[PDB]
Design a protein around this motif. Structure first.
Motif, mmCIF file in Angstrom:
data_model
loop_
_atom_site.group_PDB
_atom_site.id
_atom_site.type_symbol
_atom_site.label_atom_id
_atom_site.label_comp_id
_atom_site.label_asym_id
_atom_site.label_seq_id
_atom_site.Cartn_x
_atom_site.Cartn_y
_atom_site.Cartn_z
ATOM 1 N N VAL F 166 93.079 75.323 -32.712
ATOM 2 C CA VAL F 166 92.949 73.877 -32.855
ATOM 3 C C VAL F 166 91.646 73.527 -33.559
ATOM 4 O O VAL F 166 91.595 72.613 -34.388
ATOM 5 N N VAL F 167 90.570 74.246 -33.238
ATOM 6 C CA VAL F 167 89.253 73.897 -33.759
ATOM 7 C C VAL F 167 89.165 74.189 -35.253
ATOM 8 O O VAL F 167 88.659 73.372 -36.029
ATOM 9 N N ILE F 168 89.650 75.356 -35.683
ATOM 10 C CA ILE F 168 89.501 75.723 -37.089
ATOM 11 C C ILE F 168 90.282 74.769 -37.979
ATOM 12 O O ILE F 168 89.858 74.472 -39.102
ATOM 13 N N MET F 169 91.433 74.286 -37.514
ATOM 14 C CA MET F 169 92.158 73.276 -38.277
ATOM 15 C C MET F 169 91.367 71.976 -38.355
ATOM 16 O O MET F 169 91.338 71.322 -39.403
ATOM 17 N N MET G 27 77.546 84.177 -46.155
ATOM 18 C CA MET G 27 78.463 85.251 -45.790
ATOM 19 C C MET G 27 77.707 86.524 -45.437
ATOM 20 O O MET G 27 78.144 87.293 -44.574
ATOM 21 N N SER G 28 76.580 86.773 -46.102
ATOM 22 C CA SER G 28 75.788 87.952 -45.776
ATOM 23 C C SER G 28 75.244 87.867 -44.358
ATOM 24 O O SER G 28 75.143 88.883 -43.662
ATOM 25 N N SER G 29 74.893 86.661 -43.907
ATOM 26 C CA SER G 29 74.411 86.494 -42.541
ATOM 27 C C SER G 29 75.542 86.582 -41.527
ATOM 28 O O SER G 29 75.331 87.069 -40.413
ATOM 29 N N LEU G 30 76.742 86.124 -41.887
ATOM 30 C CA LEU G 30 77.870 86.236 -40.969
ATOM 31 C C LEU G 30 78.186 87.695 -40.669
ATOM 32 O O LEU G 30 78.577 88.034 -39.547
ATOM 33 N N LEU G 31 78.027 88.573 -41.661
ATOM 34 C CA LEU G 31 78.245 89.996 -41.429
ATOM 35 C C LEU G 31 77.264 90.555 -40.408
ATOM 36 O O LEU G 31 77.615 91.458 -39.642
ATOM 37 N N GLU G 70 84.073 83.469 -32.667
ATOM 38 C CA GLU G 70 82.856 83.107 -33.381
ATOM 39 C C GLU G 70 82.964 83.441 -34.863
ATOM 40 O O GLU G 70 82.557 82.645 -35.715
ATOM 41 N N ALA G 71 83.506 84.615 -35.190
ATOM 42 C CA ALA G 71 83.644 84.999 -36.591
ATOM 43 C C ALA G 71 84.580 84.054 -37.333
ATOM 44 O O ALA G 71 84.292 83.642 -38.461
ATOM 45 N N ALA G 72 85.709 83.702 -36.716
ATOM 46 C CA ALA G 72 86.603 82.722 -37.319
ATOM 47 C C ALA G 72 85.923 81.368 -37.445
ATOM 48 O O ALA G 72 86.061 80.684 -38.465
ATOM 49 N N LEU G 73 85.183 80.965 -36.413
ATOM 50 C CA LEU G 73 84.477 79.690 -36.454
ATOM 51 C C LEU G 73 83.423 79.681 -37.552
ATOM 52 O O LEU G 73 83.242 78.672 -38.241
ATOM 53 N N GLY G 74 82.707 80.791 -37.724
ATOM 54 C CA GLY G 74 81.718 80.863 -38.786
ATOM 55 C C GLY G 74 82.342 80.816 -40.167
ATOM 56 O O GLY G 74 81.768 80.245 -41.097
ATOM 57 N N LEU G 75 83.516 81.428 -40.326
ATOM 58 C CA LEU G 75 84.210 81.365 -41.606
ATOM 59 C C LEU G 75 84.694 79.952 -41.901
ATOM 60 O O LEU G 75 84.632 79.500 -43.048
ATOM 61 N N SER G 76 85.173 79.238 -40.883
ATOM 62 C CA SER G 76 85.658 77.881 -41.108
ATOM 63 C C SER G 76 84.539 76.977 -41.606
ATOM 64 O O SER G 76 84.755 76.136 -42.484
ATOM 65 N N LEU G 77 83.333 77.136 -41.058
ATOM 66 C CA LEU G 77 82.194 76.380 -41.561
ATOM 67 C C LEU G 77 81.821 76.809 -42.971
ATOM 68 O O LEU G 77 81.399 75.975 -43.778
ATOM 69 N N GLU H 54 76.116 70.404 -42.604
ATOM 70 C CA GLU H 54 74.858 71.123 -42.457
ATOM 71 C C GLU H 54 74.423 71.184 -41.000
ATOM 72 O O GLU H 54 73.978 72.233 -40.523
ATOM 73 N N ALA H 55 74.538 70.068 -40.279
ATOM 74 C CA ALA H 55 74.131 70.054 -38.879
ATOM 75 C C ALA H 55 74.951 71.038 -38.059
ATOM 76 O O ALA H 55 74.404 71.782 -37.238
ATOM 77 N N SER H 56 76.268 71.060 -38.269
ATOM 78 C CA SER H 56 77.113 71.997 -37.540
ATOM 79 C C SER H 56 76.758 73.437 -37.882
ATOM 80 O O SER H 56 76.711 74.300 -36.999
ATOM 81 N N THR H 57 76.507 73.718 -39.162
ATOM 82 C CA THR H 57 76.194 75.084 -39.568
ATOM 83 C C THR H 57 74.863 75.543 -38.988
ATOM 84 O O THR H 57 74.754 76.668 -38.490
#
Ligand code: CDL
Ligand code: PC1
Ligand code: PC1
Ligand code: 3PE
Ligand code: 3PE
Ligand code: 3PE
Ligand code: 3PE
Ligand code: 3PE
Ligand code: 3PE
Ligand code: PLC
Ligand code: PLC
Lengths: 140, 171, 115, 99, 120, 175, 98, 347
Positions: F166-169, G27-31, G70-77, H54-57
């Motif tokens: 849900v969040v990623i969407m 992306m380098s930091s996500l790794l 977390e990895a998926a969340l970081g990719l979404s951002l 930016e804030a979220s990241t």
């Protein structure tokens, strides 16, 4: 820092001024390296030598202040034959303040630094004698 | 602190049972029916004593009874047993399924010449009871004395004396 | 020991075949021969330019579902427990929530590639 | 726990995995089961202030079982001494220690 | 400091032993002040929404007063229980350790010497 | 010697980490994390956990495959950096290996090293248990208890993965 | 504390120092975050497998489950950062001033 | 965002925090934080503009790093004690990492740089969650591990927070950045009394939440995010400026207002433990906070800044914002000193 402070406080006041100057200069120099690290990290130098120059500028200011305090506060306690006297630290603290003024090229900062560093040094000495605790262990 | 006490090599000397794993598995069901008492005695000692040094004597009677078990097979059922464990030994998993015909020949010899009845399914997994004169260990963990508990606080709960007594507050 | 020797042999054979490929044949290397291939005409730009991923959302969802196989693969061992009523309940609950996730993304047009 | 909903409600949410001497599948024991049990039973109901000094013996054995720091130091000394003797031809290893 | 008290009543608003203590009187001054805070909430509610402060929605003002007094009564019961427990432990500990709380030898000011400091 | 296989795998494990920690192009950083995942599986697999070792390798093989696609879309430039093309990347790469060398050099010479903790260089084999298990894998029996014992763990993880979708969407909706 | 724990704990420190020193690519930091999770998984699995802590054997798996979130969340951002600037450079993330 | 999805994500934020408070196993505590971060970020991205991205990241990068350090502490604590219980840690290195991980999550100095920026980049409602609700979980853990926390480390972070928070708040005209630096300074008071009396940490947290929630509610009512935008409130809602005055004076620790209670009780506990230099320094440094609260009262309530002509159009419409619990919160944030002995319920 615990090691150096214990070395400084083990040397009786007004004796071995060559050693006490070594201890204080170490404490000041370390303080100037901690300031340089954050300054370099948060204010990126324009070049490597510009940042090494900044590190040497702050580290020498802090080392000189530490060296002058221990030297001036140790000979004063030696000439007067008064080891347990906060007045010795007041003289040492103000001298460190004057050195800050010379490095900053400001008479106003020299006067203000002498007044507040002088008081702080005197208060530090009183706390050593009385047993004042800044970070007191929980007791109740 | 302290010296670890170990038995001498003479205390550990015993006549070993030098038979391969296929021999043991072929005779396991009959072995567990005949040598139960010395087996269960030794196995109770290990779990109660928790120390292999305290069950050496029981561990020797396990060996003594296993030898007598195989000597009886060697006297009456020598040939059927050899065929049985040769066929179990052939399989990589030592499966019982593939040697039923040879198992039957081994089971009938002992039944006639020794009176041994194979345990049914689930018999050898039963929890059994064993009679032993060995005393029950009192401090098998060698625990020290547990520290005394804090003095329990009990009594009537009266109101706070003069309230909270927080600075100037009367209640 | 056996597994490691089996791996060394497979990748040693693979390596020796590559070595023979580069040292046995006769080579005639020149600039035009090694230029990148784009059907006969020079490529218009670098192959290292950004390449938009239209299934980025489905690719993120793969990360989350690929972790369900880690949680679901222990099921054959889980079925050996004596707490079958609890085990079967949580096995079905875990799979169902994995299905509700699929239903939500499907209905919200999450599996459709971006234009 | 900050709020002890588990204890009041009588529901065991996460206490079953907090210690390694608790009930395990198929009664499989942990390597330091005895040491943990002794330290837990010694220091039950007396608070951590007292247990930190009155159950110091059990907790040091428990840490020895967990990380084996003192055993490995002891093995190191024996192994190091044996090499020194052998390096200067002063000790012949027995057969059962070689083959 | 009383988080781990021996009383095995964890995550209970009022342990059953708290029923041995007198309840707060409904005329307790602390309970009247809590009720007053409810009245101020009622008036501030009218003012932010631009209503006659004193008159508007007397039904809503009463619920403010009642809600504050209702919650205040139980917070006072728990407040008094916690202080009652504090004294219970303190006196029990002093009884269990008589050596740490000896009865001092009494002296009179005719026997105790106090330095005199003139003010001149 | 094969008695040090676990230690030899852990050295590669660090070298792979210095591969992506020096932060070259994420294409090559992804390769470094695959090598570490592969050897990390080997190290865990030699302590008695085969499911755990194979599982982490399986999860990170799919993890870096999505990262690879995201690198060609959003983390690419004209000249992807290698461990030699940049002084900052090269500087951090050589520094990492040198520290690994010194730690490896001292532990194998002194059999000890003191950095925050005290480490022993006798070999990883000295701490293994000398008793055999029964007719099962202890690691497999513990992992299979998630469904009979870990009822609370299954719920929170199950809910977390659901909300994760849900969040990623929501984050990527853009409107 | 065998010699294996040294390298595993050094791997975590390398990935931590790698995460705290950004170059340009998000992306380098996500790794490095995924690298740190790998070190913690290995270190936890080793301790649990060596001590025969049977029930703890599921903890490393539960550690990977939330590493993926977390990895998926970081990719979404990272998608949204890229859509706003055309790159994943961290120097563009400076509109907000401390 | 779909209202049902917003509610579900909101409840997931609470569930993560509630898991941390009821967990007795370290793994569940870590799961609580991970669930909390997973649900908070979509509420920061709700308006979908570059500053919110930016804030979220920045928030994700900081929180993710802290959770890694917390897991390292748990595993190290596992290696040296062989148990997962949420209690005092059994290794000094584990304590430092956990203390620093909890400091990064709280935004204490010198791990504070994100708090001013994340708060500025998200709406007021999201900022209220960031500065009030996100502090419950980390404070829950510190409450249970304080016996093993290094005294110098925790007191050093507290002192730096009180200094940086006060200084940073002086150079700010954005309300979200003012509230952000105020939050950092107040974290110092909570963690300074932690080694001595964890109950007073709860008292200051409860009072800080009530006062902070009151300020955001009043900023939310008028949709004011800058000092000058708030300077027009006197010309639209005069009552709202009086409530802001009283609350700001309370946040500054001036008696007889409620916000003086946490300072008063924290000084008591530290002086009982013969800590005299630190409470005096903390109280004096807190005058920096009271200065940039006074500066907000001056431009909001005690003076009348210039208005604009279109303001006359706003006089014809009422406040349709919900302003939930504002009448109750403002009273609790101003008149509670006579009920100070009620802090015993927290024990
Ligand atoms: C168990 C004991 C609990 C005691 C509290 C019981 C009352 C609370 C429920 C009433 C309510 O709806 O308020 C919740 C809440 C009130 O928020 P609000 O919008 O700011 O209330 C003002 C409105 O103008 C309200 O105006 P309105 O026109 O929109 O509605 C009128 C409202 C009027 O209700 C009220 O009186 C509002 C004030 C009641 C809540 C006061 C806060 C709770 C009191 C405890 C906190 C103080 C602690 C004690 C003091 C400090 C320590 C001593 O009356 C009702 O709705 C009756 C509902 C009956 C169910 O509404 C919600 O959205 C949550 C539901
Ligand atoms: C535990 C308690 C904690 C307490 C914490 C206390 C925190 C306060 C510490 C703040 C120190 C800040 C010092 C700043 C100095 C800046 C100097 C500078 O930049 O130049 C300014 C100026 C020069 O600036 P200028 O040259 O550009 O000109 C200034 C005039 N205008 C503004 C018009 C431009 O120099 C000064 O005036 C400094 C005066 C020096 C004398 C200071 C003596 C102070 C002694 C204490 C007060 C005396 C009464 C108490 C007596 C006690 C007896 C025991
Ligand atoms: C939902 C929970 C999150 C919102 C609350 C966040 C506030 C956290 C800090 C203040 C906690 C309140 C102080 C403890 C308290 O009085 O309540 C627990 C009290 C007393 O619990 P206790 O005395 O056993 O201690 C638990 C709390 N500590 C350790 C922090 C003091 O119990 C209850 O009120 C629960 C019973 C009602 C259940 C419904
Ligand atoms: C005359 C000049 C005096 C020189 C400075 C004084 C040196 C002595 C200070 C001291 O006490 O030593 C501390 C430390 C030595 O280490 P230690 O093991 O503690 O030795 C025992 C010390 N009693 O020696 C020191 O390091 C003191 C200086 C501290 C430097 C801190 C600077 C930040 C360090 C991080 C660098 C930047 C980040 C690194 C990553 C970026 C890439 C390099
Ligand atoms: C590592 C410390 C942090 C750092 O990177 O410092 C870099 C500084 C100047 O490097 P610079 O080329 O200007 O980087 C520009 C990036 N846009 O160069 C420096 O590191 C200056 C500080 C060197 C260390 C002082 C001597 C000890
Ligand atoms: C550990 C020691 C770290 C040493 C720092 C790194 C070496 C610095 C090399 C010199 C860099 C150039 C520089 O400017 O520093 C010179 C410094 C005095 O600084 P200065 O040139 O007078 O700047 C103008 C003052 N307003 O003169 C110096 O004192 C530089 C050396 C600083 C350490 C002195 C400790 C006593
Ligand atoms: C720039 C940084 C470098 C300069 C500062 C370092 C020198 C001062 C360090 C303090 C000295 C110290 O650490 O030793 C404690 C001292 C007595 O030490 P000792 O005799 O060994 O104690 C055993 C007695 N049986 O006892 C004392 O120090 C007495 C303490 C008196 C403090 C008076 C200070 C008044 C002003 C408030 C400043 C402190 C509060 C600000 C926040 C501090 C955060 C660290
Ligand atoms: C600022 C003030 C904010 C106040 C917010 C409201 C919080 C107080 C709510 C009290 C409501 C009382 C409800 C009526 C009591 C009742 O009937 O019991 C309900 C429930 C069960 O009670 P229980 O103790 O668990 O059962 C024991 C049986 N043997 O017991 C309960 O549900 C208790 C209520 C839930 C717990 C509320 C939080 C308790 C701690 C108080 C926090 C406020 C501290 C204020 C400090 C200010 C300092 C000046
Ligand atoms: C012990 C830990 C430190 C080991 C030394 C690590 C530094 C290795 C050299 C290095 O990293 O590069 C030097 C760096 C400048 O590198 P560079 O990226 O080329 O800057 C200009 C780019 N336009 O300049 C630096 O910042 C080096 C700082 C040290
Ligand atoms: C080897 C062993 C040495 C021992 C030395 C003993 C200690 C002496 C140190 C002297 C240092 C030095 O030189 O001070 C010199 C400095 C001078 O100012 P400046 O910034 O250099 O001005 C440079 C200006 N230009 C850039 C234009 C050239 O003083 C000061 O700022 C002090 C001036 C103000 C007077 C303060 C006194 C009144 C306030 C105090 C109230 C309590
Ligand atoms: C980029 C590379 C980073 C640095 C890696 C280390 C290189 C220097 C090693 C010198 C140490 C030494 O003298 O020891 C040599 C050992 C040999 O193995 P051993 O099992 O200890 O045999 C010795 C003990 N005996 C006699 C009991 C069997 O080497 C290693 O095990 C290093 C790890 C493998 C290399 C990586 C693949």
């Amino acid at each position: 820092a615990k090691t150096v402070l214990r070395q400084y406080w083990d040397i009786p006041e007004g004796t071995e001024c060559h050693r006490k100057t070594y201890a204080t200069t170490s404490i000041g120099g370390a303080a100037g390296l901690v300031v340089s690290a954050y300054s370099v990290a948060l204010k990126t130098p324009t070049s490597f030598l510009e940042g090494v120059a900044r590190t040497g500028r702050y580290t020498f200011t802090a080392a000189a202040i530490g060296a002058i305090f221990g030297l001036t506060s140790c000979i004063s306690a030696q000439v007067r034959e008064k080891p347990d006297d906060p007045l010795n630290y007041l003289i040492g603290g103000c001298a460190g303040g004057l050195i800050l003024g010379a490095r900053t090229r400001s008479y106003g900062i020299g006067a203000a630094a002498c007044a507040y560093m002088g008081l702080t040094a005197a208060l530090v000495k009183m706390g050593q004698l009385e047993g004042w605790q800044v970070f007191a262990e929980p007791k109740v | 602190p302290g010296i670890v006490e170990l038995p001498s090599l003479e205390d550990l000397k015993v006549q070993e049972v030098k038979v391969s794993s296929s021999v043991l598995k072929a005779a396991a069901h009959h072995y567990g029916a005949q040598c139960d008492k010395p087996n269960k005695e030794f196995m109770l000692c290990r779990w109660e004593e928790k120390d292999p040094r305290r069950c050496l004597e029981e561990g020797k009677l396990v060996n003594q009874c296993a030898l007598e078990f195989f000597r009886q097979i060697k006297r009456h059922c020598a040939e059927p047993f050899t065929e049985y464990w040769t066929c179990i030994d052939y399989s990589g998993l030592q499966l019982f399924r593939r040697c039923r015909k040879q198992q039957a020949q081994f089971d009938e010899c002992v039944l006639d010449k020794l009176g041994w009845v194979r345990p049914d399914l689930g018999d050898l997994s039963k929890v059994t009871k064993v009679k032993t004169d060995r005393p029950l260990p009192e401090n098998p963990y060698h625990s020290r004395a547990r520290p005394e508990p804090n003095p329990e606080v009990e009594g009537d709960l009266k109101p706070a004396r003069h309230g909270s007594r927080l600075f100037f507050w009367t209640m | 020991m056996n597994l490691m020797l089996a791996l060394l042999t497979n990748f040693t054979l693979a390596t020796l075949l590559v070595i023979i490929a580069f040292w046995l044949p006769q080579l005639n290397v020149y600039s035009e021969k090694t230029s990148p291939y784009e059907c006969g005409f020079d490529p218009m730009g670098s192959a290292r330019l950004p390449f938009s991923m239209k299934f980025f959302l489905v690719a993120i969802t793969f990360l989350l579902f690929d972790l369900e196989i880690a949680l679901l693969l222990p099921l054959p061992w889980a079925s050996q427990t004596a707490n079958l009523n609890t085990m079967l309940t949580m096995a079905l609950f875990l799979i169902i929530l994995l299905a509700v996730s699929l239903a939500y993304e499907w209905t919200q047009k999450g599996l459709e590639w971006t234009e | 726990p900050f709020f002890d909903v588990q204890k009041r409600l009588g529901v065991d949410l996460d206490r079953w995995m907090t210690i390694q001497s608790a009930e395990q599948p198929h009664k499989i024991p942990s390597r330091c089961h005895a040491f943990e049990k002794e330290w837990i039973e010694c220091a039950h109901g007396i608070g951590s202030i007292r247990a930190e000094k009155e159950c110091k013996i059990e907790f040091e054995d428990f840490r020895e079982c967990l990380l084996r720091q003192k055993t490995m130091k002891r093995l190191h000394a024996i192994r190091r001494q044996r090499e020194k003797l052998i390096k200067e031809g002063k000790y012949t290893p027995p057969p059962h220690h070689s083959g | 400091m009383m988080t781990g008290r021996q009383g095995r009543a964890t995550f209970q608003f009022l342990p059953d032993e708290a029923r041995s203590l007198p309840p707060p009187k409904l005329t307790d001054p602390r309970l009247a002040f809590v009720g007053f805070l409810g009245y101020c909430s009622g008036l501030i509610d009218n003012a932010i929404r631009r209503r006659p402060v004193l008159l508007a929605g007397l039904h809503r003002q009463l619920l403010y007063i009642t809600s504050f007094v209702f919650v205040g009564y139980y917070l006072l019961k728990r407040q008094d229980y916690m202080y009652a427990v504090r004294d219970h432990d303190m006196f029990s500990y002093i009884k269990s350790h008589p050596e740490d709380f000896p009865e001092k030898d009494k002296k009179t000011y005719g026997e105790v010497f106090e330095e005199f400091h003139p003010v001149r | 010697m094969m008695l040090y296989i676990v230690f030899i795998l852990s050295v590669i494990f660090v070298m792979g980490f210095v591969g992506f920690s020096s932060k070259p192009s994420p294409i090559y950083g992804g390769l470094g994390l695959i090598v570490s995942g592969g050897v990390g599986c080997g190290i865990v697999l030699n302590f008695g956990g085969s499911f755990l070792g194979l599982m982490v390798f399986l999860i990170y093989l799919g993890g870096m495959m999505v990262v690879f696609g995201y690198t060609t879309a959003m983390a690419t430039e004209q000249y992807p950096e290698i461990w030699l093309s940049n002084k900052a990347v090269l500087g951090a790469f050589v520094t990492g290996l040198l520290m690994e060398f010194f730690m490896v050099y001292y532990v194998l010479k002194d059999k000890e090293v003191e950095v925050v903790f005290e480490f022993n260089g006798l070999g990883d084999w000295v701490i293994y248990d000398t008793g055999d298990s029964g007719f099962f894998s202890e690691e497999a029996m513990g992992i299979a208890a998630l469904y009979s014992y870990g009822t609370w763990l299954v719920i929170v993880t199950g809910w977390s993965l659901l909300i994760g979708v849900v969040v990623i969407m929501e984050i990527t909706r853009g409107n | 504390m065998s010699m294996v724990y040294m390298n595993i704990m050094m791997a975590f420190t390398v990935s931590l120092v790698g995460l705290l020193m950004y170059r340009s690519h998000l992306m380098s930091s996500l790794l490095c975050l995924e690298g740190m999770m790998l070190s913690l998984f290995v270190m936890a699995a080793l301790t649990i497998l060596n001590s025969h802590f049977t029930l703890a054997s599921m903890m490393p798996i539960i550690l990977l489950v939330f590493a993926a979130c977390e990895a998926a969340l970081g990719l979404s951002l990272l998608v949204m950062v890229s859509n706003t600037y055309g790159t994943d450079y961290v120097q563009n993330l400076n509109l907000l001033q401390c | 965002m779909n209202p049902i999805i917003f509610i579900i994500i909101l409840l997931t934020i609470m569930l993560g925090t509630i898991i941390v408070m009821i967990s007795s196993h370290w793994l569940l505590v870590w799961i609580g934080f991970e669930m909390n971060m997973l649900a908070i970020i979509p509420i920061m991205m709700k308006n979908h503009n570059p500053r919110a991205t930016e804030a979220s990241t920045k928030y994700f990068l900081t929180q993710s790093t802290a959770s890694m350090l917390l897991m390292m502490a748990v595993i190290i604590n596992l290696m040296f004690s062989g148990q997962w219980t949420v209690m005092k840690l059994f290794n000094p290195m584990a304590s430092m990492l956990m203390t620093m991980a909890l400091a990064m999550k709280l935004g204490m100095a010198p791990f504070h740089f994100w708090v001013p920026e994340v708060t500025q980049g998200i709406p007021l409602s999201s900022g209220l969650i960031l500065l009030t609700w996100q502090k419950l979980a980390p404070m829950s853990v510190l409450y249970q591990i304080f016996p093993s926390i290094n005294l110098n480390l925790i007191l050093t972070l507290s002192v730096l927070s009180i200094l940086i928070g006060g200084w940073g708040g002086l150079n700010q005209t954005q309300l979200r950045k003012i509230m952000a630096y105020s939050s950092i300074a107040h974290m110092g008071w909570m963690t300074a009394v932690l080694p001595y009396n964890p109950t007073m940490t709860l008292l200051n947290l409860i009072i800080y939440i009530i006062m902070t929630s009151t300020m955001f509610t009043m900023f939310m009512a008028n949709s004011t995010t800058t000092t000058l935008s708030l300077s027009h409130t006197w010309n639209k809602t005069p009552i709202m400026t009086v409530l802001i005055l009283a609350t700001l004076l309370s946040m500054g620790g001036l008696p007889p207002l409620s916000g003086f209670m946490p300072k008063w009780m924290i000084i008591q506990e530290m002086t009982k433990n013969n800590s005299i230099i630190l409470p005096t320094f903390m109280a004096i440094t807190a005058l920096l906070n009271l200065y940039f609260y006074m500066r907000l009262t001056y431009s909001t309530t005690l003076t009348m800044f210039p208005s604009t002509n279109n303001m006359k159009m706003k006089w014809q419409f009422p406040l349709m914002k919900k302003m939930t619990f504002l009448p109750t919160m403002v009273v609790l944030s101003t008149m509670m000193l006579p009920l100070t002995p009620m802090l015993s319920v927290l024990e």
